[PDB]
Design an enzyme around this catalytic site. Structure first.
Site, PDB file in Angstrom:
ATOM      1  N   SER B  11      27.896 -15.400  11.087  1.00 46.71           N
ATOM      2  CA  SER B  11      27.891 -13.958  11.319  1.00 46.71           C
ATOM      3  C   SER B  11      28.171 -13.244  10.000  1.00 46.71           C
ATOM      4  O   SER B  11      28.245 -12.013   9.946  1.00 46.71           O
ATOM      5  CB  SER B  11      28.969 -13.558  12.323  1.00 46.71           C
ATOM      6  OG  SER B  11      30.235 -13.425  11.699  1.00 46.71           O
ATOM      7  N   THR B 145       6.004  26.042  27.466  1.00 45.09           N
ATOM      8  CA  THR B 145       6.316  25.461  28.759  1.00 45.09           C
ATOM      9  C   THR B 145       5.053  24.692  29.123  1.00 45.09           C
ATOM     10  O   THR B 145       3.987  25.280  29.230  1.00 45.09           O
ATOM     11  CB  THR B 145       6.605  26.570  29.778  1.00 45.09           C
ATOM     12  OG1 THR B 145       7.965  26.998  29.638  1.00 45.09           O
ATOM     13  CG2 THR B 145       6.380  26.088  31.174  1.00 45.09           C
ATOM     14  N   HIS B 146       5.167  23.379  29.296  1.00 44.30           N
ATOM     15  CA  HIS B 146       4.007  22.537  29.592  1.00 44.30           C
ATOM     16  C   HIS B 146       3.142  22.495  28.325  1.00 44.30           C
ATOM     17  O   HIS B 146       2.013  22.001  28.351  1.00 44.30           O
ATOM     18  CB  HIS B 146       3.148  23.108  30.739  1.00 44.30           C
ATOM     19  CG  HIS B 146       3.843  23.185  32.066  1.00 44.30           C
ATOM     20  ND1 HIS B 146       4.606  24.267  32.447  1.00 44.30           N
ATOM     21  CD2 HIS B 146       3.844  22.340  33.124  1.00 44.30           C
ATOM     22  CE1 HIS B 146       5.042  24.089  33.680  1.00 44.30           C
ATOM     23  NE2 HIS B 146       4.592  22.926  34.114  1.00 44.30           N
ATOM     24  N   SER B 267      -3.506  14.067   0.370  1.00 41.70           N
ATOM     25  CA  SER B 267      -4.624  13.450  -0.349  1.00 41.70           C
ATOM     26  C   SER B 267      -5.321  14.467  -1.252  1.00 41.70           C
ATOM     27  O   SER B 267      -5.860  15.465  -0.769  1.00 41.70           O
ATOM     28  CB  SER B 267      -5.636  12.868   0.645  1.00 41.70           C
ATOM     29  OG  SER B 267      -6.709  12.229  -0.026  1.00 41.70           O
ATOM     30  N   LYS B 273      -4.533  18.845   5.077  1.00 39.76           N
ATOM     31  CA  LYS B 273      -3.954  17.587   5.574  1.00 39.76           C
ATOM     32  C   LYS B 273      -2.696  17.154   4.818  1.00 39.76           C
ATOM     33  O   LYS B 273      -2.776  16.538   3.747  1.00 39.76           O
ATOM     34  CB  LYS B 273      -5.004  16.465   5.534  1.00 39.76           C
ATOM     35  N   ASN B 275       0.500  15.009   5.644  1.00 41.25           N
ATOM     36  CA  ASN B 275       1.148  14.064   6.538  1.00 41.25           C
ATOM     37  C   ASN B 275       2.673  14.130   6.540  1.00 41.25           C
ATOM     38  O   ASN B 275       3.313  13.875   5.524  1.00 41.25           O
ATOM     39  CB  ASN B 275       0.703  12.654   6.173  1.00 41.25           C
ATOM     40  CG  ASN B 275      -0.798  12.545   6.032  1.00 41.25           C
ATOM     41  OD1 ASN B 275      -1.552  13.118   6.820  1.00 41.25           O
ATOM     42  ND2 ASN B 275      -1.242  11.795   5.035  1.00 41.25           N
ATOM     43  N   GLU B 280       7.926  11.702  11.414  1.00 42.58           N
ATOM     44  CA  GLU B 280       7.388  10.713  12.354  1.00 42.58           C
ATOM     45  C   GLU B 280       8.343   9.524  12.431  1.00 42.58           C
ATOM     46  O   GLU B 280       8.711   9.080  13.523  1.00 42.58           O
ATOM     47  CB  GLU B 280       6.031  10.195  11.908  1.00 42.58           C
ATOM     48  CG  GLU B 280       4.994  11.249  11.688  1.00 42.58           C
ATOM     49  CD  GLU B 280       3.661  10.632  11.342  1.00 42.58           C
ATOM     50  OE1 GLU B 280       3.026  10.054  12.250  1.00 42.58           O
ATOM     51  OE2 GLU B 280       3.259  10.706  10.161  1.00 42.58           O
ATOM     52  N   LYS B 315      27.689  -6.568  16.405  1.00 40.97           N
ATOM     53  CA  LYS B 315      27.688  -5.863  15.131  1.00 40.97           C
ATOM     54  C   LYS B 315      26.348  -5.505  14.521  1.00 40.97           C
ATOM     55  O   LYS B 315      26.245  -4.482  13.848  1.00 40.97           O
ATOM     56  CB  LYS B 315      28.542  -6.630  14.110  1.00 40.97           C
ATOM     57  CG  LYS B 315      30.051  -6.465  14.357  1.00 40.97           C
ATOM     58  CD  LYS B 315      30.923  -7.305  13.429  1.00 40.97           C
ATOM     59  CE  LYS B 315      30.701  -8.794  13.666  1.00 40.97           C
ATOM     60  NZ  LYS B 315      30.765  -9.093  15.108  1.00 40.97           N
TER      61      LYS B 315
HETATM   62  N1  LIG Z   1      35.764 -18.444  18.459  1.00 44.40           N
HETATM   63  C1  LIG Z   1      36.215 -17.318  17.935  1.00 44.40           C
HETATM   64  N2  LIG Z   1      37.428 -16.897  18.240  1.00 44.40           N
HETATM   65  N3  LIG Z   1      35.431 -16.636  17.115  1.00 44.40           N
HETATM   66  C2  LIG Z   1      35.743 -15.377  16.428  1.00 44.40           C
HETATM   67  C3  LIG Z   1      34.537 -14.964  15.617  1.00 44.40           C
HETATM   68  C4  LIG Z   1      33.999 -13.658  16.120  1.00 44.40           C
HETATM   69  C5  LIG Z   1      32.737 -13.152  15.435  1.00 44.40           C
HETATM   70  N4  LIG Z   1      32.910 -13.038  13.960  1.00 44.40           N
HETATM   71  C6  LIG Z   1      32.377 -11.825  16.079  1.00 44.40           C
HETATM   72  O1  LIG Z   1      32.280 -10.836  15.335  1.00 44.40           O
HETATM   73  O2  LIG Z   1      32.203 -11.771  17.323  1.00 44.40           O
HETATM   74  N1  LIG Z   2       6.298  25.416  36.051  1.00 46.94           N
HETATM   75  C1  LIG Z   2       7.614  25.279  36.219  1.00 46.94           C
HETATM   76  N2  LIG Z   2       8.438  26.035  35.509  1.00 46.94           N
HETATM   77  N3  LIG Z   2       8.077  24.384  37.094  1.00 46.94           N
HETATM   78  C2  LIG Z   2       9.489  24.102  37.409  1.00 46.94           C
HETATM   79  C3  LIG Z   2       9.547  23.005  38.449  1.00 46.94           C
HETATM   80  C4  LIG Z   2      10.691  22.018  38.274  1.00 46.94           C
HETATM   81  C5  LIG Z   2      10.659  20.885  39.314  1.00 46.94           C
HETATM   82  N4  LIG Z   2      10.686  21.460  40.691  1.00 46.94           N
HETATM   83  C6  LIG Z   2      11.808  19.909  39.083  1.00 46.94           C
HETATM   84  O1  LIG Z   2      12.596  19.714  40.028  1.00 46.94           O
HETATM   85  O2  LIG Z   2      11.916  19.338  37.973  1.00 46.94           O
END
Ligand SMILES: NC(=[NH2+])NCCC[C@H](N)C(=O)O
Ligand SMILES: NC(=[NH2+])NCCC[C@H](N)C(=O)O
Ligand SMILES: NC(=[NH2+])NCCC[C@H](N)C(=O)O
Ligand SMILES: NC(=[NH2+])NCCC[C@H](N)C(=O)O
Lengths: 450, 449, 449, 448
Positions: B11, B145-146, B267, B273, B275, B280, B315
């Protein structure tokens, strides 16, 4: 299908009806506000309010015309009110959108669900503390595990209080979740407030909210609270899955530590000592559907542009299921735990094995200055010889222990037989009957059992 | 075989991260040993002296990381003894690896959660400044909305929608932080210990609130880890809704905002364009944090009590999630201030010919028309305007006033964005009047004057 | 540093390095094609080609200039080719986009990795078969569990063959997964082909693909294969997690059914009856991370608009980790099973308990003509009475049986003892040695041993 | 807390969905008992006539579903004994609920995947129809990259990408189907039986390719369920990608297509607003299927061999996933055809004044110029154009020869999308002839 398939596909009435009370409560409050603000005439509010009572009676009596064709619980109560009180009905939804209406209902519903869940956890924490005491009197001891391999000896009392700390933390997560979601989206309309002389602080108070949300956009688009609750519910079942696992184990012939109540099990005619823990199994297993819910809703709100989106309707089904799951699980464990029959002796023979307490003898040397690792080897040879001679650790004599290493004295002896060796680990949080009892006092005062 | 089983169990690869934490609990631990007698004043001096060399060694990249010792704990120990002699072999007295690794993880998440709260604070601050910026000249874009144009919304309002969201994320991080700050050290392997060890001394010196009152719980519970991973997720999920929206508002189709050069790629050829790569990646990274939560949940489900080797799979996921959120909080707080929003384009989008027709309905409604009816009324008028190819703004008093005796002069102001945005002034709405108080208010909660 | 962080955050080189081979093998086939189509002279083909061979050497030497500023394995390998062969290098990436390239690489990398996985799985099923045959004679029997409660005696050989079935289906999933992703995306170029007179059937054929993908859009945007492979890995670890669970369990001092080889366990200084199954624990627990990976990636592609997006980068890390988990797991398992010690007696004693075979006794009466229900009451009454008489099922005399029910007769005596009773369930797929020996033989011809 | 536990333990509420498959399996099991010799002829031809009454009752709403009996298995049985008498209680001879429920799930899914395959073939069929339709006058919209206008692409081409996708989905489902078509019936509780039971007989009559080779495995495996869910998840994921795009292309900002009234919502107030309600739900429902997969996995992790009550958590998530993909597959086949693509707004956005400046780079580079520079040359050009406020449709052959000698006359047709849209003619390319080719390949794969 396909216009029908569409209708069906879009409808939420099949599940959102579970919130009819929350929708009714909001209705009364919101209708009362419309009046206070001048948007509704006393004569009108009077009717709406009169009509809302009939609706509730109809619902509680199974005579409310639940129509899928009306799409959701919202239009369902509304349509009905208008059938009961003519025109007035058509003003109840003034200055409101389904958007802020739904989020209010959902939050309203969770606060209650959570309060009922907190209630269920107190009860569980009580049976725990109560069970800890019931097995501290005639002292119950069993083996503590690690890698599912027996290690130092532990008290059932310390064990129950283990789940006490766990379930206590759960209660605090549901609490903090509850407090944080206790804001009101009511008044945010579709996404931006309104020009209407609406009063959100009034609607917030009367509905139990600490205050109205401060941003109409987030008011309508947020569901992070649903996610926060689902996680609390996830962790909770995980704690319960831990306990089911151990009770399912200790319930085997191999362990023989405990007998599960017939009420929560199934046996076998042609078979003598066989009993299956179906309920404990289902609790263990149900942790997944709750994890499944959290994953589902998170995937939903990912990269979801802002404000209302129909995607948002996918939020209710998972919760209702998750809540019911955790709800019913907590209820069962509290009805099953005290019915548990622990076989004391088989546990004791298991805890105090043949040489498990030798760990104690090692610590003893270490405390006196012998390098704990150095002590682990000298102590090891000791047992190693005991095995060679086919003798248990309980048979060692002081003289014999003195020949082994000078550090040993009269005081080391009480550490050979579980009967007295358990009193050893008396540090804060240890298994020693003194430390456990001290802790069973807090727990008592804490859950108000005493 | 042979070594595979070794590398598989090792580990060390990732637990090195908690080196500062381990190093710290060692000092506090040794010091406690001395305070309870288990350690000689001369031994502690040596131990403390060696631990400093270790810190200096690791920091220098000159410390010896031995995979053969499998984890961070034994690595620091092997090295201590290699340096200080016999005293080393005494450091790990009255302590188990079980309570030791636990104290470490939660000791580390406290610090991580602090760096993260500092980042969110920073981030909220820039949303608020960005809000003040586009508030005066006055930026307005369509509310969605939508994903269809709903109602004109103020960009300042938009930043505040995230201000509240991230604000709630801090609450979860805070509340989660506060709950794990219990000390598990001094719990041994699962039951307590026989040594005259003092847990309050360590808990306290190590920053913890107080000692955990159950040795079993203390070394088996990793629920705090799941409460943080849960917050990280909801936190990243909030960031994906913002990233997605910026990636959308910066297309040629929308044309609402332009991403800083520092965080995007393009580009030479196509001049447009641009990006939005950073956003993202931020958006797609919500996936890892989700996965981390699932991974760990799965690991702990149905796990018999006490310590189990499985607990070690705790971890890696955290480290990654923590790393993903942190990096995302930084990048957006760096990127957002540099956004170029296209005022005019946004303003035209918002007033799409008849978006304000919804304002006329509320108008009738407030005067007295039911509302479902008020709706039908403005719609019959809207249809008439589309037929005659006329925008809502070109309507006149008498004509509007003709369509329904309830329409009066005071309604006129509702036909143009310029004056209509001052309409939804309910608490929390986009009316400048309103957004301004939620904006003062915000500034105070983070640093205004 | 903001600019610094931005770069780091986007850098994919840290993990796509793993694909240097596939990217290399690709650079070759693509160039040979660029030549065969005229975009490169033989003097250029030879130039690039030799530059690649050098790179393969610099990489497999520890001398390759792995440079992060270059962002990923593609340009790192490229930037170098232009440093080794000069000008012809800058033509290697003609009519190809980083889009169809990174995708071609991954599909290629998994195919190789699946084969490895298939070898590992194949190897594991052989060892399952070896152990089955070994424990068949002398005949090893143990309890067949249900609700983790003793149900009906079973054969270790049947247990093993069970997993055999499981691992057999896993490999199959891996098969169909591979043969489905084995279509080439090279030449989709960004999205939409190119005017370049490229021959993608050439590059498809020479890179091992059964064919080139029929749609450039799909070719560049899809990662459903990565998702399909991940699912297989998930089910694979899950099957393993179950066996791991049973060995961890069976090796406890409570069950005592088997002993784990020290090569894969841990013990104690002052104890010997203790042996910890760390590896088996870790194997079980790591089923979580593979699941989390599938979840991570599925969440990345949900609602992802078409063509390439920076979001896809998030595909490699998860795959590499899951594939490595399952790989080492299939390895450790293979090396660990043949070396454990099954306790003959303890197991047999647990299988044939006090009256567990009484069920066979009721099936007897039912076959003779007693409603399967009725027969239970009878035999149940029989056992109930034996529990009081303090006797074992292995003591009923033909006399007592005929006394309980006239339908009992001579041929029922062998149902009273385990040694003769495990021959009862001889139905297809049963545990009767007659049946198992038959599936074991079949299983052997199947895995060629 | 008796009722609570009963309800918590009951599976009837949902496992009753598999009655058809349970009734079918009973008939076969009985047919085999008689054969094997465990039921007189009188008995079989009594249990059968009783299984017919049960069907009629279930289909008519008169069948008594009792929660107290727990599952569908006991329910049907209880009614059999009630309807026929003693013969009823021998139907369960040499059988467990374990090998019985495992079988029923396998029976259900098979019919399920077959239903899904038909829906996929139906969807892919319309996708191909749509591709054709939009090739006629010829539709072009921009291909995206980072959601930025990349290179013009054919709408028909767009539809075929999804055709390749669903094609693979059909493949995962098809492979998942046959891998699970091996009868587990006969494994009994977890080991076979001493009863002269015939396992190949049952398998055959029940549509199975054969009996599972290991009692233990057969009763304990849910990997098939895990496999099916995965296929569902990945498939649904494909639908969410398309859904997202339709939601996006129908915004007022993109304005490429309109969603049919029967799958949208709107407002007379704002007549330009049209909400893709069904598409947004089809997108969102990508999550519950994800979660279904996760939940079932978590259930089987570290789960000891043989049967365990835990395995009862298999039906609910599968029923919900199946209904989700099912309906989603249907809605789309009904929705897509009614769509109205705006040929111009689309075309217009494709050709954005410089878009095709990429075709000049692939020109210079093909003519012999090292691509890395060719692309750099054209940059100068576009750059000089933005400064002159000029297009790329306006460029003149001279201005071209002016910029770089390698430019010939055969390069002018690369400036107007009208003509340039024919450049990408490599296999799987967006060029009309390429697409027109694939489109005929697809027609044949289904129906020309
Ligand atoms: N047999 C044990 N007591 N091991 C302890 C090691 C635990 C390990 N480094 C962990 O982060 O989980
Ligand atoms: N076009 C709208 N504002 N629609 C709201 C509808 C919400 C829907 N009845 C729900 O329980 O999630
Ligand atoms: N803008 C682009 N086309 N970038 C392609 C780089 C893709 C990246 N190496 C990945 O694995 O996803
Ligand atoms: N103890 C048993 N053999 N129970 C079998 C019941 C299985 C349950 N009806 C299910 O669908 O999962």
């Amino acid at each position: 299908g396909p216009d029908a398939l569409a209708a069906r596909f879009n409808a939420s009435l099949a599940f959102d009806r579970a919130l009819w009370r929350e929708d009714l409560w909001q209705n009364r409050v919101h209708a009362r506000m419309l009046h206070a603000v001048g948007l509704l005439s006393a004569e009108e509010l009077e009717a709406i309010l009169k009509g809302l009572d009939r609706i509730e009676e109809e619902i509680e009596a199974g005579t409310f015309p639940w129509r899928e064709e009306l799409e959701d619980v919202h239009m369902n109560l509304e349509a009905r009110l208008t059938e009961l009180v003519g025109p007035p009905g058509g003003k109840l939804h003034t200055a409101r959108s389904r958007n802020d209406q739904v989020a209010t209902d959902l939050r309203l519903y969770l606060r209650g669900a959570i309060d009922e869940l907190l209630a269920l956890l107190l009860a569980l924490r009580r049976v725990l503390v109560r069970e800890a005491e019931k097995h501290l009197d005639p002292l119950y001891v069993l083996p503590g595990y690690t890698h599912l391999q027996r290690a130092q000896p532990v008290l059932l009392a310390h064990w129950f209080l283990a789940y006490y700390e766990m379930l206590k933390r759960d209660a605090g997560r549901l609490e903090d979740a509850k407090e944080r979601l206790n804001e009101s989206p009511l008044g945010a309309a579709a996404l931006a407030g309104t020009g209407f002389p609406i009063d959100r602080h009034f609607t917030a108070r009367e509905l139990g909210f600490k205050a109205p949300m401060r941003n109409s956009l987030d008011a309508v688009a947020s569901r992070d609270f649903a996610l926060e609750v689902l996680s609390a519910l996830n962790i909770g079942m995980l704690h319960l899955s831990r306990m089911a696992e151990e009770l399912i184990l200790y319930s085997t012939e191999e362990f023989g530590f405990v007998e599960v109540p017939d009420a929560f099990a199934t046996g076998s005619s042609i078979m003598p000592q066989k009993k299956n823990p179906d309920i404990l199994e289902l609790i263990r297993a149900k942790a997944g559907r709750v994890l499944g819910a959290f994953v589902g809703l998170s995937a939903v709100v990912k990269g979801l542009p802002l404000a209302y989106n129909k995607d948002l309707q996918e939020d209710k089904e998972p919760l209702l299921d998750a809540l019911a799951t955790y709800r019913d699980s907590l209820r069962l464990l509290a009805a099953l735990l005290p019915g548990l029959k622990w076989r004391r002796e088989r546990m004791w023979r298991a805890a105090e094995g043949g040489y498990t307490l030798a760990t104690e003898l090692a610590d003893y040397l270490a405390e006196k200055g012998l390098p704990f690792r150095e002590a682990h080897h000298v102590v090891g040879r000791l047992v190693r010889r005991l095995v060679e001679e086919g003798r248990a650790l309980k048979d060692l004599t002081l003289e014999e222990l003195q020949a082994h290493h000078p550090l040993f004295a009269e005081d080391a002896l009480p550490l050979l037989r579980l009967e007295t060796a358990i009193h050893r680990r008396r540090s804060y949080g240890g298994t020693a009957p003194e430390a456990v009892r001290e802790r069973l006092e807090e727990a008592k005062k804490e859950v108000g059992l005493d």
